[PDB]
């Protein structure tokens, strides 16, 4: 508990621990059992074997911890592949719900870094798990083996970059769609400006309640126009190519 | 029982179906001595189990490159036997 | 050109594409030294010519039991190298 708390969560540090304990055991290696000094004889081998077994048990139990976060990276793998299948099948150049599309498009860029992140984790992992077999692990089927998953991650990355990039390039149609959409938004904005100038009920002769209802209708359609303008602007900045 | 560790080598499938593969292939290797027969038993069992269609190879020296259905592929080792099982069809 | 006389063990497909498989496998063997690469090359070539989804197996010792669509199956030997090419997808 003490050493684990001091280490905390650090995989590379953990690999350093393992190489350190391995080299410590190796340096401990000896054959003599009794260092006689002068006429004085001392047992040396009994405690030698005992502490060697202590090292072995300690090193083994230390190894035992890592499998759990290995399961973590496993779940990361799974969550990636099972869901990325659906997500690649999802979007298309058409489907003027492009906003959501470009939303996910922005999403996938946000993922790219994490990809590299996960990738290097896998690299660290693919090193530590190697120790696992030369530390003689009983890899229980329970967990995926090598590319058992891996291969699947490589497949994942390649499939993402094959099609997502392409569909990102075919966006000029979406670009001009956004262009005409915002143009219609500006036209409706000018129309609503003119309607507001016409509709000014500022005169006191009008009944407060009826003109209130008319202003409520105006405000409903005005909030609708505001929603249109803000959604067009946010789609523009999310797509950010236009 | 001869404890032949099953090295689920490469895979696009769930963990339960891979362990079912390991168990079924261990059973086949205990039951038959012919690689063609091992592959036949494994393929027939999985055809009965997860609905067609699979392709299974059992052997010592073979290299492969195919297309399978997603979540429906495994390749592993039992003892000195490499076993590939992928679904495409 | 090393006359590795192709001996055909099984075939459910036309003589023209039989010869096509023999020629493509000979080209792959002359070009590649890894069985997996030979299988990938033959699979890719047959994906290009006779359309996916093909599946190719190259090896010296393997047992196979697969389902294939009609008119798209071959299993033959070039020297000691057995090659099983069948369509499934």
UniProtKB/Swiss-Prot annotation, chain A:
Cytoplasmic dynein 1 acts as a motor for the intracellular retrograde motility of vesicles and organelles along microtubules. Dynein has ATPase activity; the force-producing power stroke is thought to occur on release of ADP. Plays a role in mitotic spindle assembly and metaphase plate congression. Dynein heavy chains probably consist of an N-terminal stem (which binds cargo and interacts with other dynein components), and the head or motor domain. The motor contains six tandemly-linked AAA domains in the head, which form a ring. A stalk-like structure (formed by two of the coiled coil domains) protrudes between AAA 4 and AAA 5 and terminates in a microtubule-binding site. A seventh domain may also contribute to this ring; it is not clear whether the N-terminus or the C-terminus forms this extra domain. It is found in: Cytoplasm, Cytoskeleton. Belongs to the dynein heavy chain family. Homodimer. The cytoplasmic dynein 1 complex consists of two catalytic heavy chains (HCs) and a number of non-catalytic subunits presented by intermediate chains (ICs), light intermediate chains (LICs) and light chains (LCs); the composition seems to vary in respect to the IC, LIC and LC composition. The heavy chain homodimer serves as a scaffold for the probable homodimeric assembly of the respective non-catalytic subunits. The ICs and LICs bind directly to the HC dimer and dynein LCs assemble on the IC dimer. Interacts with DYNC1LI1; DYNC1LI1 and DYNC1LI2 bind mutually exclusive to DYNC1H1. It comes from the Eukaryota. The modification N6-acetyllysine is found at residue 60. This is Cytoplasmic dynein 1 heavy chain 1. The modification Phosphoserine is found at residue 165. Changing residue 129 to R: In CMT2O; impairs function. It comes from Homo sapiens. Transmembrane segments: none annotated. It is linked to Charcot-Marie-Tooth disease, axonal, type 2O: An axonal form of Charcot-Marie-Tooth disease, a disorder of the peripheral nervous system, characterized by progressive weakness and atrophy, initially of the peroneal muscles and later of the distal muscles of the arms. Charcot-Marie-Tooth disease is classified in two main groups on the basis of electrophysiologic properties and histopathology: primary peripheral demyelinating neuropathies (designated CMT1 when they are dominantly inherited) and primary peripheral axonal neuropathies (CMT2). Cortical dysplasia, complex, with other brain malformations 13: An autosomal dominant disorder characterized by global developmental delay with impaired intellectual development. Some patients show signs of peripheral neuropathy, such as abnormal gait and hyporeflexia. CDCBM13 is associated with variable neuronal migration defects resulting in cortical malformations. Residues 106-187 form a coiled coil.
UniProtKB/Swiss-Prot annotation, chains B, C:
The modification N6-acetyllysine is found at residue 36. CDD domains: DLC-like_DYNLL1_DYNLL2. Induction: Up-regulated by ATMIN, PAK1 and estrogen. GO terms for molecular function: deoxyribonuclease inhibitor activity; dynein intermediate chain binding; enzyme binding; enzyme inhibitor activity; identical protein binding; nitric-oxide synthase inhibitor activity; protein-containing complex binding; scaffold protein binding. Its main location: cytoplasm. The keyword Cytoplasm applies. It is found in: Cytoplasm, Cytoskeleton, Microtubule organizing center, Centrosome; Chromosome; Cytoplasm, Cytoskeleton; Nucleus. Keywords: Acetylation, Activator, Apoptosis, Chromosome, Cytoplasm, Cytoskeleton, DNA damage, Dynein, Host-virus interaction, Isopeptide bond, Microtubule, Mitochondrion, Motor protein, Nucleus, Phosphoprotein, Transcription, Transcription regulation, Transport, Ubl conjugation. There is a cross-link at residue 43 (Glycyl lysine isopeptide (Lys-Gly) (interchain with G-Cter in SUMO2)). Phosphorylation at Ser-88 promotes recruitment to DNA double-strand breaks (DSBs) by TP53BP1 and ability to inhibit MRE11. Phosphorylation at Ser-88 appears to control the dimer-monomer transition. According to PubMed:15193260, it is phosphorylated at Ser-88 by PAK1, however, according to PubMed:18650427, the DYNLL1 dimer is not accessible for PAK1 and the phosphorylation could not be demonstrated in vitro. Residues 67-89 are annotated as: Interaction with ESR1. Acts as one of several non-catalytic accessory components of the cytoplasmic dynein 1 complex that are thought to be involved in linking dynein to cargos and to adapter proteins that regulate dynein function. Cytoplasmic dynein 1 acts as a motor for the intracellular retrograde motility of vesicles and organelles along microtubules. May play a role in changing or maintaining the spatial distribution of cytoskeletal structures. In addition to its role in cytoskeleton and transport, acts as a protein-protein adapter, which inhibits and/or sequesters target proteins. Homodimer. Monomer; the monomeric form is incapable of binding to target proteins. The cytoplasmic dynein 1 complex consists of two catalytic heavy chains (HCs) and a number of non-catalytic subunits presented by intermediate chains (ICs), light intermediate chains (LICs) and light chains (LCs); the composition seems to vary in respect to the IC, LIC and LC composition. The heavy chain homodimer serves as a scaffold for the probable homodimeric assembly of the respective non-catalytic subunits. The ICs and LICs bind directly to the HC dimer and the LCs assemble on the IC dimer. Belongs to the dynein light chain family. This is Dynein light chain 1, cytoplasmic. It comes from Homo sapiens (Human). The lineage of its organism: Eukaryota, Metazoa, Chordata, Craniata, Vertebrata.
């Amino acid at each position: 508990e003490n050493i684990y708390n001091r280490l905390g969560e650090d995989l590379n540090k953990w690999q350093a621990l393992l190489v350190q304990i391995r080299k410590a055991r190796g340096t401990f290696d000896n054959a003599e059992t009794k260092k006689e000094f002068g006429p004085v004889v001392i047992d040396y081998g009994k405690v030698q074997s005992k502490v060697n077994l202590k090292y072995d048990s300690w090193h083994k139990e230390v190894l035992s911890k890592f499998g759990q976060m290995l399961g973590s990276n496993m779940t990361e793998f799974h969550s990636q592949i099972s869901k990325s299948r659906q997500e690649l099948e999802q979007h298309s150049v058409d489907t003027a719900s492009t906003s959501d599309a470009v939303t996910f498009i922005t999403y996938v860029q946000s993922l790219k870094r994490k990809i590299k992140q996960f990738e290097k984790q896998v690299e660290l992992y693919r090193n530590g798990q190697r120790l696992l077999e030369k530390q003689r692990f009983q890899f229980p089927p329970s967990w995926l083996y090598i590319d058992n998953i891996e291969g699947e991650w490589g497949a994942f990355n390649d499939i993402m970059r094959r099609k997502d990039s392409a569909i990102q390039q075919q966006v000029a149609n979406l670009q001009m769609k956004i262009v005409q959409e915002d143009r219609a938004v500006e036209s409706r904005t000018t129309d609503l400006l003119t309607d507001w100038e016409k509709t000014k009920p500022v005169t006191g002769n009008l009944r407060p309640e009826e003109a209130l209802q008319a202003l409520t209708i105006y405000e409903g359609k005005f909030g609708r126009l505001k929603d249109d303008r803000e959604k067009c602007a946010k789609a523009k900045e999310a797509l950010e190519l236009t | 029982m001869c404890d032949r560790k099953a090295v689920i080598k490469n895979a696009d499938m769930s963990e339960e179906m891979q362990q079912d593969s390991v168990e079924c292939a261990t059973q086949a290797l205990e039951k038959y001595n012919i690689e063609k027969d091992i592959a036949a038993h494994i393929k027939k069992e999985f055809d009965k189990k997860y609905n067609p269609t699979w392709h299974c190879i059992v052997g010592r020296n073979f290299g492969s490159y195919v297309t399978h259905e997603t979540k429906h592929f495994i390749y592993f080792y039992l003892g000195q036997v490499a076993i590939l099982l992928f679904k495409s069809g």
